[PDB]
Each structure stands twice: as structure tokens, then as C-alpha cells.
Design a protein around this ligand. Structure first.
Ligand code: JAQ
Ligand code: JAQ
Ligand code: UDP
Ligand code: UDP
Ligand code: NA
Ligand code: NA
Lengths: 229, 229
């Protein structure tokens, strides 16, 4: 029938990839679109993405615009392709997106503008492109699952995941991203050019406690949430 | 009925803007989409474009990717808007595009890559974005009118038009762009990811002689060309 689209949102190393790969396995009606940036961080997209990530570590204020535009186009095409290719013989089809087009802009790109890694012209061009690129759209979300963790939990999980380039990320940065997610998804204080988002259902899940071998209660809340949509 | 789409192609100051504003007036069935870059060179797009042009004059190797992506998105939306808003009560509707999506990539963006104003990653990202952005398309061309002028004619016409920032453009640069237009539109030696372009009809017009008050013979060739499409 109609595929349900659910974004999984959360800070760096909150556990979105872990959670998505749990969900993947529990039902033939449940599919997953991993975040392109996540995969680049692990082929022509993969080659461009690896180069942009490395370039960004050196000089965020030169590459933030290029990076954000490509990260968002790569997400849009990977999401469209899952919508068109998968779950068509399924009865209650669900697509779980690792993050969204809205996190790209209102979390990451916004944060880079706010750090002066994009200048006003780059941020304005980026918003114009984003506003327009997302009309020329059937990616509209049925609901958002927020994986809520403390900055400290995420900082610990960055250490656990043990990526060289990430070991430098400081608590202060994560506390910034955390704050943006609280404003957007909990207090719902964040305005956007996407009217329907104000009324989109949000499930908030506390993932401060390890869930890798103990996720039944989280999946129960996901199944209840899905029944309301 | 079905709007016919014709790109007007030519080197800098060949006379495309002059020619398009002649055509505009000759028929209620004839509409024109000026090139966004041309208008920026004369409002939020206008403000972004002015800033990007000025930034480009200072540092082409920093802004070529940002400039080319925005110039092409601005063209795509201005072309789409003319296709959807105009010529609907008209019997033999024609839209004349000042340049195309194909000149953006195969002339300008290509030329900037070739001058090392874009690095390989920027050029590859740009081509990926272009390939994909132009599927998510009803802008396909019925025919191309090539306004063919010598580099010297164009250099003279840059002096005539008398834009401060352009008075620095050297013959060598124009000879480069000229060569690209000859390869693409005359010898048809240039390959592209747009199969149909190999078979698109091209009218070549010599505009070395001033036509502003003497254009009847050119318009006669345009009307004959249109009757074949
Ligand atoms: C790879 C990489 C390299 C570098 C950076 C980075 C480093 C430092 C700073 C602060 C700059 N300061 C300059 C001086 N000032 C005084 C203070 C500030 C900002 C950024 C970040 C990333 N990853 C990102 N990943 C996304 C991302 N992830 C998913 C989705 C999506 N859309 N974007 C965004 S940044
Ligand atoms: C505004 C502006 C400022 C600057 C330039 C510019 C200047 C110099 C150079 C050569 C660099 N060199 C560096 C060192 N090397 C040794 C040799 C080379 C390249 C470029 C050009 C433009 N306009 C353009 N306009 C379009 C354009 N027009 C319509 C449509 C469309 N898509 N693009 C492209 S560039
Ligand atoms: O309940 C959890 C969730 C995550 N992790 C680990 O924490 C890191 C971050 O998880 P993930 O990469 O899924 O986070 P994402 O960036 O996708 O949110 C990884 O090493 C996980 O194996 C964990 O040990 N227990
Ligand atoms: O037959 C012509 C065509 C053009 N021009 C002048 O040459 C310059 C370049 O023309 P245009 O701006 O139309 O060129 P485009 O860049 O649009 O090709 C302008 O000053 C025109 O008025 C001219 O004097 N006679
Ligand atoms: Na599944
Ligand atoms: Na007209």
C-alpha cells in the first residue's frame, strides 16, 4: 500500500545506526536508508564523499557549502531510490530514514553557518537550493523518532565507535547539536519553511542506557507509535 | 498546444540578449527567458548573484563551484516558471532560452575545471548534481540557434557594451569559449550524458555584421527553422 516514512533523528553517536540495523531485521515490511555521510565515514559518490570529508577536517570554512549540498542531494536520491525500488509486495511497509533533509538544514548546515564555516551568501544560496530542491516532493515524513541521549553519552559512544577523526570532537560542540535537537523535536520551538513539520508526530526515546542486547521496550514504543500513524 | 523550446547559444557579447529582445517583440506566440547570470550583471536571487559575481572576480578558484551550481539552479527555475505560466492561450507557442543547462556545464563549468578554478572533486560533484538535477525533465530542447561571431567581434562588442568588470577579458579567453562552441554546435564533436542532443536541430547564424536595425534575414532563417520542428 502507501510506504510510511519515519526519520530517526539524534546527536552524533546517539545510536541511530545501531537502532536502524536492529529495526531492519525485525520485519520484511521494514526497510532502512542509511545516511550517506555515515557511509562515506565507513562508489563515485563514495569517492566524492571521502574527499569532501577529508577536505572538511582541514578547512571547514572552505568546504561546508560543497559538503552540505552534496550530503543533502545524496540523501534525497538514496531516499527516492528506496521509495521506488523496495517494499512494493509488502502489506504494512515502513521506511526508516537515518536522519532527514530537515536535519541536514536545521541542524548541520545551520550549525556551520552559526560557526561562520559558511558566509551569509553561502547559507542563503543553501536555503534557496534546499527550499526549491525539496519541491521538484513525496519524501514528506509520516513521523519522527528522536533518539535522545546526553552529550556525555554521545561523547562516550564516539570513544566506543573509535573513529580516529572523531576522537577530537569536544563536549561543547555536542552540547550545541544537542540543544538544536531539543529546540526542534522536544520544545518544538524551531520554525521551518515546511508547514506540515509543526504537526508531524514525534516519538522521543531515551537511549542513554545501552540497548544493543535489550531493545524490546524501545521496539514496543516504535510499534505502538506506528499504529497511531 | 505544446510550447517549443529553443536555446540561443553563443560566446560572450555575440549578441544573444540583443537578438532575444528583437524576437520577443515580433509575435505574441514568442516568449524569452533571459540568462540569470546576465540579469545579475545588470531580488534575493539577485542579491546572492551580485555577491557571487563580485566574489568570483576576486577568487575564481574559491567560488566557481558555488557560482556554477547557483547559475544553473536559477536557470532551471526561471525556465520551468516560463513553461508553466506563459503562452498558454497561444496557437504556435515558442520559448527562446538565453543559453541552456548544457552551455552551463559543457561551456562554462567545463572551462572553469580546465582552468583549475574547480578541482576534480568539485567538477565530479558538479556533473553528478547536473546529471541528476536535470531528471527530477520537460526542459528538453526542440532546437538550438547558434549565434556565431569571431572572438574579435565579441571583444569589440564587450567594449561596446562597456561593463567595467568585462573590459579586462582577453581575446585568448574568448578564443577558448569560441572553440568550445565550434566543437559542440558546428562539428558536433562534443559528447554529453544527454543522448537526444546528438540529434537536436541546430540553426547556425553569422552575426559578425551588426543586425540591431537590419535583422529581417536572420528572423527569416528563424521562422524557416521553426517550420521544420
Ligand atoms: C567531517 C567534518 C570535518 C570538520 C567538521 C567541523 C570541525 C570544526 C568546526 C568548528 C569550526 N570553528 C572555526 C573557528 N571558530 C572560532 C569556531 C568554530 C565545525 C565543523 C565537521 C565535520 N563533520 C560534519 N558532519 C556534518 C553532517 N553530518 C551529517 C549530515 C549533515 N548534513 N552534515 C556536518 S559537519
Ligand atoms: C564573474 C566572473 C569572474 C571571474 C571569471 C574568471 C576570471 C579568470 C579566469 C581564469 C583563471 N586563471 C587562473 C590562473 N591560471 C593560470 C589561468 C586561469 C576564469 C574565470 C569569470 C567570471 N564570469 C563567468 N561567467 C560564467 C558563466 N556565465 C554564464 C553562464 C554560466 N554558467 N557561467 C562563467 S565564469
Ligand atoms: O545502545 C548502544 C548504542 C550504541 N552503542 C555504540 O555507540 C556507538 C554509536 O552508535 P551509532 O554508531 O549507532 O550512532 P549514530 O552516529 O548512528 O547515531 C557505536 O560504537 C555503538 O556500537 C552502544 O554501545 N550501545
Ligand atoms: O548586432 C549587434 C549585436 C550586438 N551589439 C552590441 O554588442 C554588445 C553585445 O550584445 P549582447 O549584450 O546582446 O550580447 P550577449 O552577451 O547577450 O550575447 C551590446 O552592447 C550590443 O548592443 C551591436 O552593436 N550590434
Ligand atoms: Na526488513
Ligand atoms: Na512576445
Amino acid at each position: 500500500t502507501r510506504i510510511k516514512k519515519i526519520s530517526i533523528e539524534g546527536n552524533i553517536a546517539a545510536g541511530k545506526s545501531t537502532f536502524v540495523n536492529i529495526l531492519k531485521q525485525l520485519s520484511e515490511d521494514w526497510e532502512v536508508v542509511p545516511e550517506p555521510v555515515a557511509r562515506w565515514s565507513n562508489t563515485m559518490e563514495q569517492k566524492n564523499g571521502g574527499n569532501v570529508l577529508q577536505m572538511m577536517y582541514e578547512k571547514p570554512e572552505r568546504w561546508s557549502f560543497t559538503f552540505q549540498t552534496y550530503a543533502c542531494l545524496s540523501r534525497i536520491r538514496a531516499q527516492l531510490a528506496s521509495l521506488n525500488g523496495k517494499l512494493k509486495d509488502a502489506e504494512k511497509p515502513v521506511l526508516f530514514f537515518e536522519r532527514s533533509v530537515y536535519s541536514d538544514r536545521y541542524i548541520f548546515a545551520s550549525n556551520l553557518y552559526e560557526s561562520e564555516s559558511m558566509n551569509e551568501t553561502e547559507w542563503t544560496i543553501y536555503q534557496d537550493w534546499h527550499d526549491w530542491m525539496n519541491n521538484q516532493q513525496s519524501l514528506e515524513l509520516d513521523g519522527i523518532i528522536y533518539l535522545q541521549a546526553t552529550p556525555e553519552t554521545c561523547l562516550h559512544r564516539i570513544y566506543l565507535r573509535g573513529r580516529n577523526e572523531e576522537q577530537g570532537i569536544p563536549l561543547e560542540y555536542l552540547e550545541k547539536l544537542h540543544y538544536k535537537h531539543e529546540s526542534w523535536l522536544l520544545h518544538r520551538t524551531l520554525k521551518t519553511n515546511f508547514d506540515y513539520l509543526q504537526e508531524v508526530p514525534i516519538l522521543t526515546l531515551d537511549v542513554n542506557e545501552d540497548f544493543k542486547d535489550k531493545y524490546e521496550s524501545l521496539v514496543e514504543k516504535v510499534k505502538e507509535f506506528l499504529s497511531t500513524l
